[PDB]
């Protein structure tokens, strides 16, 4: 499959971007500098980017920065920065209430919820304890804030009233997500359990215990996401294992290993694009696409810099990623679907695009883990294809040795 990097740094992973700015003056003469195409002007933060989301209407995007902590809003109809707005403390998570960019809620890291209206900062309120995720229930206008403590806070936008907080059995909520079809809330606790709640009442419909046989290590639920079908459900773990659950049955329908041992940062359901059976499980380093039924890898995105968030423009084949780099990357996999209407001519330049392409296909293992698994004797064998400081093993063969070990 063909993956094109429409925007993003094209230097070595070892080379940082700021020197490329210093190289920029020296390389102005080079023709490639003229030929390179930037899709959105200033599509970049000073040092790094934290979160990226697209407004439902499809013409505006919003992003958050590291320093000075700021809030870009991009206008697709003009391919340009609309306005940048500074803040008091760095962002941890937000949502866009309105269909446009006008109306948003931002959970900062200093424990404060800031309500950004179109004019400017409207109101700032504080939750009792530190926040980790934030979701909005359109049906009740009740905003739900995960927290370090057991209780899951509830804020009611309609009444302007903190309501009775939900109480979880375990402490620490890493992500929260609301099923659109049913209203089921899933709360990702620190311990290997995901607790489901009914919003109309205030109860615990059930708690699912995640079981991984491969690794005995403890693992934390880091992300959750409900598919629009209203039945399937996804989980991430801190061990880099993404589960797909049919809610009715407790058994995990499929378990896929990302293989780098890094926490899963986001799950996106690619139902809208067509050929609905695909899903994205984004890591610190890789964003893999694969099919929900067979578990086979479809495509992989391997940016040169760490991924903090990934977002899929609905109805299109485009992907944005907020990175630890100065620019935010934009990818375009034509096979998925047509280019967006605002990028109407993106197809025209496909050949001029970079067209980036083993690493997603196999499972990565460190030198130490090889010793734990007593696979030292295979070092140098065609089974162990060494890369970087570790060795790659077929996922199936990894499952075999781990159980034996």
């Amino acid at each position: 499959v063909s993956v094109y990097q429409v925007s993003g740094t094209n230097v070595s992973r070892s080379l940082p971007d700021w020197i490329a700015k210093k190289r920029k003056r020296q390389l102005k003469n080079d023709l490639e500098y003229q030929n390179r195409v930037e899709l959105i002007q200033d599509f970049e933060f000073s040092e790094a980017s934290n979160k990226i989301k697209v407004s439902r209407d499809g013409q505006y995007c919003m992003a958050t920065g590291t320093y000075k902590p700021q809030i870009h809003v991009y206008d697709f109809a003009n391919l340009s920065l609309k306005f940048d707005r500074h803040t008091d403390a760095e962002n941890v998570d937000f949502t866009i209430l309105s269909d446009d960019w006008t109306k948003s809620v931002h959970l900062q890291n200093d424990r404060s919820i800031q309500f950004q209206n179109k004019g400017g900062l409207h109101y700032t309120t504080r939750i009792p304890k530190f926040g980790r995720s934030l979701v909005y229930n359109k049906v009740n206008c009740d905003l739900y804030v995960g927290a370090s403590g057991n209780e899951l806070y509830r804020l009611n936008l309609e009444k302007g009233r903190f309501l009775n907080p939900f109480k979880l059995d375990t402490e620490g909520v890493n992500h929260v997500s609301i099923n659109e079809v049913n209203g089921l809330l899933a709360a990702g606790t620190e311990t290997n359990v995901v607790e489901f709640w009914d919003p109309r009442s205030r109860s615990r419909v059930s708690k699912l215990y995640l079981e991984n046989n491969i690794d005995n290590r403890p693992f934390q639920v880091t992300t959750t996401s409900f598919r629009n079908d209203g039945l399937t459900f996804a989980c991430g773990t801190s061990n880099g294992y993404s589960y797909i659950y049919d809610l009715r049955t407790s058994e995990p329908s499929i378990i896929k290993d990302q293989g780098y041992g890094f926490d899963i940062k986001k799950i996106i359901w690619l139902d809208n694009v067509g050929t609905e059976n695909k899903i994205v499980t984004c890591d610190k380093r890789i964003a893999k696409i694969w099919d929900r039924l067979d578990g086979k890898a479809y495509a992989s995105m391997e940016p040169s810099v760490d991924i903090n968030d990934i977002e899929h423009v609905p109805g299109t084949g485009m992907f944005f990623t907020a990175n630890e780099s100065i620019p935010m990357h934009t990818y375009y996999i034509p096979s998925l679907g047509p280019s967006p209407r605002w990028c109407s001519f993106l197809d025209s330049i496909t050949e001029e695009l970079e067209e980036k392409p083993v690493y997603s296909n196999y499972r990565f293992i460190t030198r130490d883990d090889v010793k734990k698994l007593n696979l030292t004797h295979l070092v140098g064998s065609r089974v162990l294809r060494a890369y970087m400081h570790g060795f790659f093993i077929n996922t199936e063969l990894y499952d075999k040795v781990s159980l034996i070990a």
Partner: peptide, 30 residues
Amino acid sequence: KASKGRKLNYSVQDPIANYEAPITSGYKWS
């Protein structure tokens, strides 16, 4: 204790009053 919001206060807050209106449709499933 209650200072800095560490104790949860359930008063009406004027600026956020009627910030968004609930949808009358409700959940799509019956």
